[PDB]
């Protein structure tokens, strides 16, 4: 319960009815300048750009008293943020700034780092950061994430990402630090260090105390619909929409097909998701009020090749592997659509989110989801495809039936859905 956490909330920047407002009760003034885009749908984010003189700018001016009573001891700052395209060699940008007369705090991004800084004065600072895994994010860390910074002058400065502690350092003496009542959201290139980047922000809160990990996680979860499956960037997963389907174990592989067998090939364009075939998700059972995909939904997958649409389906053929057994393992392949929903095309999805990615698990299901018989995975098996006279190894999607529970903890069962730009 949020009740006790909220007693210490001193700023609650939100988009309410196409207006940015402070809902904390302290009535900070909120103003906008330039190109600021408000999202009318959940999560109600605002969007800023880095390019142009009409560059967007959100200015929050707080009541001087409430900052003075709060920030000099212990405080917490939390917010959802998304950056695109957050490439590994990004130049330096200040993004959320509360520095005045060379003192205050500020948040910036540079390379693969998001940085929170206490500025004591012109010559003194103390910073902490989150750095994303470059090897796991060649196309950029372009996903929504939840930041929480906590500070205690008699203790530590900490930063959390999606409810996990990432960095912590003892706060040094910061005699004479003066906190500003103004916070400015603007993507401001730092000169003495290219493409436009966008930043999306929603639910930017400040608390007048140091939140512990438990409360941070309660807050984290209170700001999400955890049964709404997410696409790779953290936005709601949708039916009837094209995605590139990826396996978490094999992000450098795109999805292809060969003789009605789906196979995974190595990407040529490692800095993008723009190769191979796309899938569209089709609802069999779920919430008909919208086209969002939810855990427990029954569904099937379509793939179009040369203007012809196929269903993904679980094959009933014996599988062959060099070393492993293949008991209860079945290839997922392509079959021609029919008038009726055949049992072998049917799956049930569940969200599977991680600190550093948004994915799902996909289970083989019957029409009503009363019989869940397997989980989708991936592996290297021997096939005769195309013109093959001999059997060759292909990396293919599979369903593991039998006692599939053993595979539940495997990242090989985690599937991401990257939205197509076109």
Give the CATH number for residue 275: 2.80.10.50
| Boundaries of domain holding 28 | 1-231
Sign of CA dihedral 188, 191, 192, 197: positive
> Do the beta carbons of residue 379 and residue 332 sit within 8 Å?
no
Q: Are residues 197 and 296 in the same domain?
A: no
User: How far apart, in whole angstroms, are the C-alpha atoms of residue 185 and residue 107?
Assistant: 10
Residue the block writes with tokens 């630090």: 177
Method: X-ray
Distance of CA 96 to the CA centre of its chain: 20
> Do the beta carbons of residue 300 and residue 311 sit within 8 Å?
yes
Give the experimental resolution in Å: 2.2
User: How far apart, in whole angstroms, are the C-alpha atoms of residue 322 and residue 383?
Assistant: 11
> Do the beta carbons of residue 30 and residue 22 sit within 8 Å?
yes
Final residue before a domain boundary, out of 211, 231, 251: 231
Compute the CA torsion angle 297, 202, 195, 95 (nearest 10 deg): -150
Q: Are residues 301 and 216 in the same domain?
A: no
Nearest C-alpha neighbor of 143 from the set 114, 183, 166, 106: 114
Beta strands 156-161; 20-22: pairing state: unpaired
Residue the block writes with tokens 């512990």: 212
Compute the CA torsion angle 248, 252, 256, 261 (nearest 10 deg): -50
Distance of CA 345 to the CA centre of its chain: 28
Tokens of 147: 């930041």
Residues 6+ apart with CB under 8 A from 69: 208
Query: Is the bond preceding residue 43 a cis peptide, omega within 30 degrees?
Result: yes
Q: Are residues 55 and 164 in the same domain?
A: yes
User: 206: how many CB neighbours lie within 10 A of its CB?
Assistant: 27
Q: Are residues 58 and 158 in the same domain?
A: yes
Question: Residues forming the annotated binding site for a ganglioside GD1a (d18:1(4E))?
Answer: 250, 378-381, 412
Tokens of 98: 């509360």
Compute the CA torsion angle 142, 228, 362, 136 (nearest 10 deg): 20
Question: Residues forming the annotated binding site for a ganglioside GD1b (d18:1(4E))?
Answer: 257-260, 277
Distance of CA 115 to the CA centre of its chain: 19
User: Rg for the chain (alpha carbons), in Å?
Assistant: 24
User: How far apart, in whole angstroms, are the C-alpha atoms of residue 12 and residue 332?
Assistant: 47
Q: Are residues 145 and 237 in the same domain?
A: no
Q: Are residues 282 and 294 in the same domain?
A: yes
Return the bridge partners of 165, or none.
Answer: 160
**What per-residue string of b and e applies to 37-61 under the rule 16 or more CB within 10 Å gives b?**
eeeeeebbbbbbbbeeeebbbbbbe
Beta strands 103-110; 113-121: pairing state: antiparallel
Q: Are residues 218 and 266 in the same domain?
A: no
Q: Are residues 202 and 74 in the same domain?
A: yes
Tokens of 389: 């006279």
Q: Are residues 62 and 17 in the same domain?
A: yes
Residues 6+ apart with CB under 8 A from 373: 363, 364, 365, 366, 401, 404
Return the bridge partners of 161, or none.
Answer: 147, 164
User: How far apart, in whole angstroms, are the C-alpha atoms of residue 246 and residue 268?
Assistant: 15
Q: Are residues 300 and 349 in the same domain?
A: yes
Question: Residues forming the annotated binding site?
Answer: 250, 257-260, 277, 378-381, 412
Final residue before a domain boundary, out of 186, 211, 231: 231
Q: Are residues 152 and 255 in the same domain?
A: no
> For the chain, how long is the longest CA-to-CA vector?
80
Question: The CATH number of the domain where 17 resides is what?
Answer: 2.60.120.200
User: How far apart, in whole angstroms, are the C-alpha atoms of residue 50 and residue 314?
Assistant: 47
User: How far apart, in whole angstroms, are the C-alpha atoms of residue 13 and residue 286?
Assistant: 33
Three-state SS sequence of the chain: CCHHHHCCEEEEEEECCCCEEECCCCCCEEEEECECEECCCCCCCEEEECCCCCECEEEEECCHHHHHHHCCCEEEEEEEEEEECCCCCCCCEEEEEEEECCEEEEEEEECCEEEEEEEEECCEEEEEEEECCHHHCCCCCCCCEEEEEEEECCCEEEEEECCEEEEEEECCCCCCCCCCCEEEEEEEECCCCCCCCEEEEEEEEEECCCCCHHHHHHHHHHCCCCCECECCCCCECECCCEEEEEECCECCEEEEEECCEEEEEECCCCCCCCCCCCEEEEEEECCCCCCECECCCEEEEEEEECCEEEEEEECCCCCCCCCCCCCCEEEEEEEECCCCCCHHHCEEEEEEEECCEEEEEEEEECCCCCCEEEEEEEEEEEECCCCCCCCEEEEEEEEECCCHHHHCCCHHHCEEEEECCC
Nearest C-alpha neighbor of 84 from the set 95, 75, 73: 95
Specify the number of domains making up the chain: 2
Nearest C-alpha neighbor of 77 from the set 101, 92, 60: 60
Q: Give the Å distances, CA to CA, from 259 to 266, 274, 279, 333, 334.
A: 18, 22, 17, 9, 9
Final residue before a domain boundary, out of 213, 231, 249: 231
Q: Are residues 217 and 237 in the same domain?
A: no
């Amino acid at each position: 319960s949020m009740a006790n956490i909220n007693d210490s909330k001193i700023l609650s920047l939100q988009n309410r009815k196409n207006t940015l407002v402070d809902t904390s009760g302290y009535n900070a003034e909120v103003s906008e300048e330039g190109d600021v885009q408000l999202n009318p749908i959940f999560p109600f984010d605002f969007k800023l750009g880095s390019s142009g003189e009409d560059r967007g700018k959100v200015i929050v001016t707080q009541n001087e008293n409430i900052v003075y009573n709060s920030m000099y001891e212990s405080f917490s700052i939390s917010f959802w943020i998304r950056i695109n395209k957050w490439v590994s060699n990004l130049p330096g940008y200040t993004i959320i700034d509360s520095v005045k007369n060379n003192s205050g705090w500020s948040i910036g991004i540079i390379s693969n780092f998001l940085v929170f800084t206490l500025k004591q004065n012109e010559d003194s600072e103390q910073s902490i950061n989150f750095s994303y895994d470059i090897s796991n994010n060649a196309p950029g860390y372009n996903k929504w994430f939840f930041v929480t910074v906590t500070n205690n002058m008699m203790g530590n400065m900490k930063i959390y990402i999606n409810g996990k502690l990432i960095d912590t350092i003892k706060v040094k003496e910061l005699t004479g630090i003066n906190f500003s009542k103004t916070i400015t959201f603007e993507i401001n290139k730092i000169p003495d260090t290219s493409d436009n980047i966008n930043m999306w922000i929603r639910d930017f809160y400040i608390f007048a105390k140091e939140l512990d990990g438990k409360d941070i996680n309660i807050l984290f979860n209170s700001l999400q619909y955890t049964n709404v499956v997410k696409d790779y960037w953290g936005n709601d997963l949708r039916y009837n929409k094209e995605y590139y389907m990826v396996n978490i174990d094999y992000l450098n592989r795109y999805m292809y097909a060969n003789s009605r067998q789906i196979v995974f090939n190595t990407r040529r364009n490692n800095n993008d998701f723009n190769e191979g075939y796309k899938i569209i998700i089709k609802r069999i059972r779920g919430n008909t009020n919208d086209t969002r995909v939810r855990g427990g939904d029954i569904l099937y997958f379509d793939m179009t090749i040369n203007n012809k649409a196929y269903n993904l389906f679980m094959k009933n053929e014996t599988m062959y592997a060099d070393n492993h057994s293949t008991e209860d393992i079945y290839a997922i392949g392509l079959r021609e659509q029919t008038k009726d929903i055949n049992d072998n095309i049917i799956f049930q999805i569940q969200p599977m989110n991680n600190t550093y990615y948004y994915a799902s698990q996909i289970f083989k299901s019957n029409f009503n989801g009363e019989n869940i018989s397997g989980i989708c995975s991936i592996g290297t098996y021997r096939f005769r495809l195309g013109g093959d006279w001999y059997r060759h190894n292909y990396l293919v999607p599979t369903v593991k039936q039998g006692n599939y529970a053993s595979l539940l903890e495997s990242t090989s069962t985690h599937w991401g859905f990257v939205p197509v730009s076109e």
